[PDB]
Each structure stands twice: as C-alpha cells, then as structure tokens.
Amino acid sequence: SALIERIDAIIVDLPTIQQQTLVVLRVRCSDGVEGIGEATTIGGLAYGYESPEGIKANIDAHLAPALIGLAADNINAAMLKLDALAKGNTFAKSGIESALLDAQGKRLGLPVSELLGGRVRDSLEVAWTLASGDTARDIAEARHMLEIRRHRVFKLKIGANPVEQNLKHVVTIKRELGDSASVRVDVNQYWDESQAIRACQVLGDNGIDLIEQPISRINRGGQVRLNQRTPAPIMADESIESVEDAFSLAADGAASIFALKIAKNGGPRAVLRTAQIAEAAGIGLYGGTMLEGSIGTLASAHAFLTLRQLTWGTELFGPLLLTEEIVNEPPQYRDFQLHIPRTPGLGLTLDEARLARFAR
Amino acid sequence: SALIERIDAIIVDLPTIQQQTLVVLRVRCSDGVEGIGEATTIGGLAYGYESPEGIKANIDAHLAPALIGLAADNINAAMLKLDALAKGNTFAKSGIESALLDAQGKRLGLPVSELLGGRVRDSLEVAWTLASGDTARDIAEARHMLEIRRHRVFKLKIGANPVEQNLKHVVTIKRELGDSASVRVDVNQYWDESQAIRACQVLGDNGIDLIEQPISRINRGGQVRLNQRTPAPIMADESIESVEDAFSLAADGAASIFALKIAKNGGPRAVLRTAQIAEAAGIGLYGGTMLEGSIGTLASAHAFLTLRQLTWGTELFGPLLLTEEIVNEPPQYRDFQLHIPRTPGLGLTLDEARLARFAR
Amino acid sequence: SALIERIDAIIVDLPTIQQQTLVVLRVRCSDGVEGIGEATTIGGLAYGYESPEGIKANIDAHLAPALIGLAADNINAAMLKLDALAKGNTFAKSGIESALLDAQGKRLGLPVSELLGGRVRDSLEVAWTLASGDTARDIAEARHMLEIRRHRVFKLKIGANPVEQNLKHVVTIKRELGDSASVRVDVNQYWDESQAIRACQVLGDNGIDLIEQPISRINRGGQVRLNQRTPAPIMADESIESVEDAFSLAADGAASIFALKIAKNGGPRAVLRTAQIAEAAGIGLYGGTMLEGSIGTLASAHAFLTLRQLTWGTELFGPLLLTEEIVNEPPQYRDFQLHIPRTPGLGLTLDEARLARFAR
Amino acid sequence: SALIERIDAIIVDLPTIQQQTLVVLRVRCSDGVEGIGEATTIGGLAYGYESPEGIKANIDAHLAPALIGLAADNINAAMLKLDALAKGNTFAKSGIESALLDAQGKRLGLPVSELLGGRVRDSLEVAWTLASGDTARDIAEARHMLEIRRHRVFKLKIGANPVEQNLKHVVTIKRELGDSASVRVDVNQYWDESQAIRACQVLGDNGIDLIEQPISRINRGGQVRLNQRTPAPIMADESIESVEDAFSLAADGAASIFALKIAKNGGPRAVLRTAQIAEAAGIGLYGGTMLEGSIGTLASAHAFLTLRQLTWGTELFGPLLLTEEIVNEPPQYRDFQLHIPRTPGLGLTLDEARLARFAR
C-alpha cells in the first residue's frame, strides 16, 4: 500500500572533536511515514570509491528515480532493483535501505532490529580508536575511558609510520594497560606482506588481540598466509567490499574475523547476509563503522543486535566523535556499551534546525 | 507483546494418488493468534534422520518446552535458542519456524513472503516428477500435464534400476517430448561415481537439463569432479543437510545448482540463508520439496518468492499428490505455476474436521 | 538359525554423582539368548540430533520392526539393512548393534572383543574429566584420583567462559600437577577459529597434551589450519558423526587424532571401521564416550581392546559417574585402567529390579 | 583355548587350460582342527614382489615361527603380530589369515563369511578374461560362455601390443557382442599416461565399461588425471599394494573403482579394511583375483559376500583355469555366478593324494 514518494539525499558537514561529512537520506512515503538513513564515508574517496558528492549525485540521478512509485514496504524488491540498475554503490544503497527500514519500522511500530528478525541483546560492546598519535596521550585517554566505564577495548590506527615506531607505540600502550583493556590494531592496508610478517608476530607476542586489515586487499594470498601464520588473528575489513567478497574470503580462509560494515555491504540486510556467511564458515564477527552518526550507527546496531555472537564486539563509536548531531536522540553510551532502545524504526528523529544548519 | 503459549505437533497420515505422513504444528500465542507449520519427510528415516515419530517426540520433549513463554514475535531469538538447545533437527525446526512465521504474519496482517523481505514475483514455476515407473505412461502423463498447462518441466527419479535401463527410460522420454518440456533426473544418491561418470555424459548428451544428486553425499570429491566433468549441470540436494553444508559445498565447487528445501535447512529463514550463500557464490537455485502439503509447500513458496532468481524453478508439487488436505484453501496451480496469495501468514487455515480425521 | 524375536528400547534415568539418561536395548532371540545394548547421549539434543525420546521412538517405530524375523547371527546383514532403511540414527543403531553383538557373544560363549577379531590387551587407560568448575577443587580431585591410582590422565571441559579464564584455569591445573598427570582439554566446539588461534598456542606452550575439538565442525578449513599450526595436537570428536566423516577428515588432514565413539559411528563394528581408516591415514586414536553406563562402556571397551594402539588412551569413565546401575557386574577400575573380563558377550547381565526401578 | 601348533607352506604346481603355482597353507591347531589357505601369485615376481619361493621361505623362516603357541582363535592378535614382525608380505600373510579363518570356521561351525560379519548374498557375479589372443576366437569364447550361461562379463588383457592393435581388438569384440555382455580391459600398468589419454577415450566411446589399471602405479597424478578425464571409469588394482595404499588413492581421487584382492592386502580381513575405506569414500568395488585356486578363491568370495555392493562384480574365475585341484569340492559356477556354500570355514577339504601329486 504505502509507496515511496520522494527521496532526499542531503550532504551534511558536522563538527567533530575537524569536520565529518554524512549524506542524510529522507525517504517520504505516501502513507505520511518518513524514514531516515545515512551514507557516510571517511575522507572523500580515500576509504572507498564512494564520496559524499558521488553518493548524492547517483542517488539523485539514478537510485532514487528508480524507486519512486514503488511499494515502500517491499524493501527486498526495491533493493534488488537497485542491484539490477547499479553496480556497487553500497554506501548509497546502504543509506537508502537504512531509510526504508526506518520508515517501515515506524509504520509497523517495530524497531528495525525486530524487522530484521529480532534482537538477542539490547546493547553492544563498543571499542574506541585512540587517535592522538601520542603514546602517553593515548594511554591517558585509555585510562580515562576505562575510568568513566565508556570503553575497555581500544584500537590503534597504524601503518602510517615506520613499522618499528608503530610497533613500539602499540606494544608500549598494551604493556602499560595490561589485562585491563583489549588492544587491537587497524593497519588499513598500509603494510605489504613483507612488512606484516614481522609486525604481526611482534604484536601477537605482546598481547595484541587481533590485527585488522594488515595488508592490502590486492594481496589475497598474503591474507591467506597471514591468516595461517599470525600469532594474532587476522580480521578482514577493506577486503570486503561486498557480500560476494565475504564469500570469496571465507572460501579462501583469508581471515578468521570479518568486520561488519553496512556501508561496505549495502545496508543492514546486506551486512547480515555477510554475517550469515561468516557464521556458516565459522568466521568471527565484529561490528564495524565508517564513523557514521547516530543514524548510520543505529542502523548498524539494529542489525548487530540480531547476531548470535560478535566475538570481538563493535566499534560503533561514530557519534561520540561529533560535537553536533542532526537527530534529537543522543546515543546511549554506558558501561562499555551502546544501548539500543526498543522504539520503532531506528528510534531517531531529525533535528530539523541543525539539519538546516549543517547541511552544506 | 505476544507470547508462545503452547505448541502442538500432530502426526497426520493422508491418502495420496498410499499414505503420506506430515507433522502438523500449531503454535498458539497469548494474543489469540495461532500459526501452523509442517515438518514432513518421506519414508520414516529413509530420506533423513528425522522421522514423523522422532519429530513429534523431540518437539514435545525438547524444542517446544524451550519456547513457551518466549516472545512469539522474536522469531530469530526463538530459532537461535532452538539451535543452542538442539543439534540438527532441521525438519522439526522448520515446522516450528514456519508456524512462528505464519502466526507473525496474521498478527501483522502481512504475507510471510513480506515478513521475509518482499516478494519479487507472485507465482513459481512448478516441475512434476513423473512416477508411473513406465516410460510410455510417463510420456503420456507428460503430454497430459503439458496439455492442461500444469507442468512443462519434468523430473525422473532414477538410480533404482540398472544404469542402462534408467538411461534408456530417461532418454526415451526426452527424445519423445523434444523441446516442449525440460527433462531432469534425481538419482537420490543411488549411484557411485564410477556409475555416474558414464550416465551423466549420456544424459547430458541427450538433452537432460540437469542431474540432481547423482552420487552420495559421502563422496565429496566425486561431486566436485562431476561438477567439473558432467555435460549436464550437477545439483546438490541430499548433500545439503544444513546451511553450513551449503557453504562447504559452495566453497568446494561441488555443485552449480543448490536445491532449496526448508526441511533440510531449518525453515524459511534458514533456506534463505542457504540461498543467500548460493547467490554469493554464483550457484543456481531450485525450490525443493520433501513432498509437503499446502502448509509446508506454502512456507517454502513464500520464501522462494523473495529470491532474485530460481534458474531451475521449483518442484513444489507436494499438495497435488494428496487426495485430501488438512487446510481449507486448495493450492492454486495454473499455467505451469503455483500462485501465492498476498493474504497474511501462509494464507492457510486448518480444516479442523479433516485434521481430526487423518491425525493418527 | 537363531532369529531376532523382539527388541525393547527402555528409557532409564539414573542418579549420578543429577540424572543421566540411557536407552537400554534388549534383543530377544528365538534361541532363548538375549543381548543387551545401550544408546546414550548427553542432554537430550545438545550433544547430538538423537535424544533418548527420539531414540526409543525410532527404534520402536522403524529400526526394530525391520529386524524381527531376521537371523540374529547375521549382524552385518541386519546393520546393513538398518542403513538402507534409515539415514543417520547412529546412536539408536549403536545400541542395537551392541545388543546383537552381546547376544551373539553369549550364544557362542565368546567375549565381544573376540567376536570383533580378538583383543590385544585386557584393560584400557581411562582418563577422567575434572568438572567441579573450581581450579583448586579440580587439582585436589586430580591429586586424589592419582592417589588411589584411578586416573593419571585428566581433561578439562572448557570454552564456556572467557578464553582467558579457561586458559588460566587449565594452565594453573597443569602447572600444579606437573609431569605426574597428562592434561587435555575438550572445548566441545565452543571456540571459533579466531579464538582458538591464541588459546591453542598457550595451551600447547604450557604442557597441555592435546586439544579436543577446539572449534565447530562447520569450520573444516579451520580444523585443517589448526591441525597445521597448533603446538598441541588437534583431536576430532564432534566433527565425526559417521565413518564417512572420518574418511573426509582424514582425507583433509583435519586432525592428527580421532576420538572413537560407537554412538557417533553406529556401534562397535562401525567404530572399528572409523579406527581402521584412522590407522590407514596414520591418525592417532582415543577411546571416546557419551558417558555410557557399563553396557555402552563395555561395548566400547570390547572394540577398543582389538585396537593395535590407542596413543591417547580412553575416557571410558562413564559408569563411575552413576551412583546406580542397571547391570549386576560393577565396572573394574584399578590402576588407571578399566579391566575387561574374557567372559562371553559384554560380560553383563541386567539387574532386573533396578531396571524396573529407574526405567522412566 | 585352541593353539597354533604347526603351519605348513607347500608349493604346488598345477596344470592349467601351462602350470599355475600356489602356496598351500595348512595351519594345524591343538584342538585337532586344521585350516587351509593359499598364497598365490602370477609369474614368480612379475606381478608382485612375492614369489612362491619367497613366500614359502619367509613363512617357514619368519611368519610361522612367530605364531606357534599363539591362540588360533585370536586372529586379530596373530595377524597384528605378523605386521609388527614383517613389512609387506601380504600374499604370505593372506594365505595365513585365510587358513586361520578356515580353521576358526570349522571350530565354530560357521562359514567364514559369517565369521567376517554375515553374508548379504549367496553368490557373486563372475567375469571371464578372454585370453585366446585372437579377436575372432575371443568373440567365439564370449558367445560360448554366454550360451552356457557361465559369464556375461568379459575382460581383455591388453597393453602388450601396439595401442591401436589392442584398441581395434577390444572395440571389435565389444561391437560384435553388443549389449549382451559387459566388456572391460585390464592394461596391467602397461601404458604410460601419454598412451592412455587416447586409448581411454576410444575405449570409453566404444562401450568399454571400465578401464582397469591403464598406467603404472608410479604415476599417481596421471591416475588422478585419468580418473577425471576418462569417458570410462578407472579402476585401481596394482596401485593398491596395501590397505594404506587404498586410503592414499581414495584421498587422492585416483580411481572411482577399487579392485579387491586379499593377496594384495593381506587376507580376507585386510581386503575388507580396504573395501570399508572404498565404501567410505564412495569408491566402487570389484572382487579381484591373482588367479587363486578354490582355496584362495573361496577365501576371497567369503569376504566379498559381506560387501553391501560390488558394482562391477568379481573376476573370481581362478579355479576354472586349472584342470586339477588340490581340494575335493569343485567350485560351483552356474548362471554367471560363483555360488558359495554355507558350510563351516571355507567349505573346502584337501585332496591329499593330489596335494602329494602336484606338490613340487
């Protein structure tokens, strides 16, 4: 019955704790109900082929036009249509599926986690990226985050400095924190196998719990090798740019952990398809992020809530990086977790004034 | 909101065109809504480790008790719980998930296909197993089924007679029918690789469209080999006894086609998990059956309706084999297809009198 | 000459040191001889798809009817028939083959180990699962078991608590016991490869002799990987759900040790088929248990007696867990071993009164 | 109870339809019972490393001495002992296990097939090697054998003449016989992969049912390749020189059919170990022969009788090649089969006079 009448893709720049750009989606349905979503990336084109500009451009010019007039309640049909009409564009697709799921949740008065099957938990463990680039600074922030019971899992973004420097930094931090916190790294494809061979060993020998995307996705055999040789488990993130990529990697034994990002898969339903594959292969899960705001973070969270298990938790800390939001409901972070309300849809409403404010 | 108050597993023997036993499930919810499902097999234990007797025994003694008091609306949590409490028992689990999905569909007034994402079609191509055991009779039945436009896809159950005899039979039928019908075989694991090597070639060289489960699931390498050497595509059925089996087979390249049976996977949601994996690997789909009645057939159909594509259609002909049904709504078979109503749930209601009649 | 006249499957709940349920089998032969067997599992459906209820249901409804009138002396023909009529149901099949072997042993006045070829030993090393869940408690029990010379091999059931907690627990116990006892673990599929990677290393680096089923049977490649990378040998248990599973695993190099459980294979003859395959591949053996009572334990033992070698002994401690038995002859545990009499059959007779007592 | 008191290995040369040498074994037990066996090969050392001379030499000097005093009833222990004391020597071991099984069968009054588990059939299909070396003669012999209903399955020993000549010969014979008989070849390792590539295709394209050992056992990859490319199934014979060889081949996918020869495995129990492995891998079976007399043929037959299935029958025609036998009971060949009596042991007794006659 309800139809998709219009979809708006709005580029919004928000201040952080330094701007963060999100593409807010608003799908208006003939039944008066409106869903909101979010297609967010990091650094224009540096973390994916989809920039905020390219995202809005294609939604406006291609994806949205293909949906107007379609049943808002038939998300599958809509999303399958988007797949027949467009190659990739998972970020843009993710924002749209998120909005459609939100709209469908308010319409049925069910939270998205329920639309997606039913939550098995009401909160998710949330990791925190220590980014000060200063070891002492990072250890202080870690101790602080532990103090206020906000985070007990920390990840270090490395690979940008000499291998030995990052190794020192990361091992110093773990050394200092001990068993009071879990320490992980994310090399974001910065190392080549020859560099990863030694670093991975050192990290694993010094209490690092997991090594996220050490080398580039272009070296598949190296991932398979490190998944066999690293003392510390290897997690695939950038290597997954789609659900089929997830199967490919699982079939190869390229990672014992898969990071789950709706943006890299195509939305909440798409990320569960990847998760489903991981569970079938026996691969461990992790709730990933592209540093989304509450909308994208909640879209992710609602999906992760249905997961039987997330051995390595999540890094759904995106909203805490922003000093301003475009939704009224502030994220609920208490005791190392993100608490998700049972309210319908994503449980979020737009802060119209701020939207107008930061919309570029 | 609504809770699972009581689940009934009823063994029903129905006359066929020779009895057919189904285990009818009735899950009654605290909100007055009741869902019906079906856990059906063929021949006691000859086609699966789950017999009608074992199915009712375990639902009563284990599965059902674990669900009473649980939210009827949180199907994922319920089914995940059944997985934590019981190994296998996909048939029993399938009947229960089917009933839960039915009950949830009436409660929200949405057809199960929609609960499952949204249908991309309203009917499914239906194949017909020619069973007369007589070549001439089978060819007659084929032409008859073509005439009344009920079936244009036929499968022959072989492997029970000498290889040459079945080969002759099957090739004679295809030759006689020409391009007016698609002819497939299902050897039900009856051949060993050494027998399949020649038969598969002959069948493929004589217009047989696909070869369903030629050899036993115990010979994995043989399946991988035949998937590489058969002139006719190899479809995996019995080899899949779970979603993880589907991943295993896909990772191996053991079949270019996967038959989808909710019974062998654990229900409508479980069969879609397997289908999702097949789609990710690029494996072709087929809607399979354990010869369910309208309930199981409709539970399957509602899931298959959301599938982007089913290259080889379905064999959802189960209800046409029975001369009596325990539901009021007769299956809609017209023009080589099974038509699925948009009505809520499975769109079926129990024929109380007949239920009482055939319930053993 | 002698025929199978009737088979009784009796569900018996016995008190333990907390109930333990066994399905006692009684096969009555036309020659007056009667054999007894046992189909026992742990926790209904939590350790196998076969529950006590499902076991009795299928024996009564399917397996037994197929055997009445058949030659009691032709166990092969009978068991092969059960395989043609039923998929899986190894537990139920195991109880029946055990009873048939017992009956055939009394009839020929030969112990089952002899029927099975001939014993090469008269006793088996028996391991003991320390289960108190309390480290200090477990170390005390270990020291005690060593004292009375009952056990010098101990296994810890882990995987239910955080990896670090179980690691600590297990390493603390080994540390404390030193070279006076062998310490093994059984994770019962509780870990996912990403968790097993580090735990296995730690365990192997701290004197743990072997790691039983660290990850789930759904992750085959992970087993192959850990069988290559674990400092401590990997043993397959739950991964084997049949003799063909054993071949599959051996062909893959998924474990350097196979646990031998008649229940998971289909009986004493079936477990030897698996053992035979293991010996051919060079895979090490272990006498496994589903915590059977004296009947199932003796059925297992009689088979394990014919084994050339059992590098890691057995865990045939099932009877010591029960405070009551349904057989008259008490198990012979002395000097870290289970001593098997040369008496005919299993060397056991039913304690009719107790049978009637605990039969549910 | 009964012990092995003395074992005699007697070399006997028998006239054929041209001599055939067998090593007759006589194991005398302390209980008065005596078992007879046979260790027979073809051509001294040309078909195995074990010649009649080497066989008697080692039994006398090594195997037999190790058994005197041992329990005649504990065959497993005895045979396992022979394995600990001697590498290979399967022929010699086979004659001894055969004799032990015979002696144990008379002692218990059970036929060997029963000692081995229980027969599932009373006769076996018997193939016939057409050896005239003349196409026309061979076709005549084939029609004759069909007429008297003695054989309907024929094999041609090829590989000794140019590939084309043998191809012509073999294809001419099949063409001439049509579907009235099954035609197979045995190249006895005579071809190298480069020759087999074309021949196998031609043979398979001209109705040859299977290709026995086309190339040498030294080329493992070639066997794996031909098992993948031959239009006609590949059977392994010479490649199997032990049970572990059988596992190796099955693990490799080197043949879809395994020939079963007790001589190449180590006796009736050993051949069943190989058969069990084949059944587990899904490999097809065939009862092979080294052209044994009634003793070796019956030892084989009693084992093959317990086999669930032998897709390609047997070639147990050995006794029909001899014009004189050293046993009193003449083999029962009627209607394409060898009929096995239910009598105890092998059902054979020595023809003392003839034994003394032909014993070299």
Ligand SMILES: [Mn+2]
């Ligand atoms: Mn990452």
Ligand SMILES: [Mn+2]
């Ligand atoms: Mn099928």
Ligand SMILES: [Mn+2]
């Ligand atoms: Mn275990």
Ligand SMILES: [Mn+2]
């Ligand atoms: Mn041969």
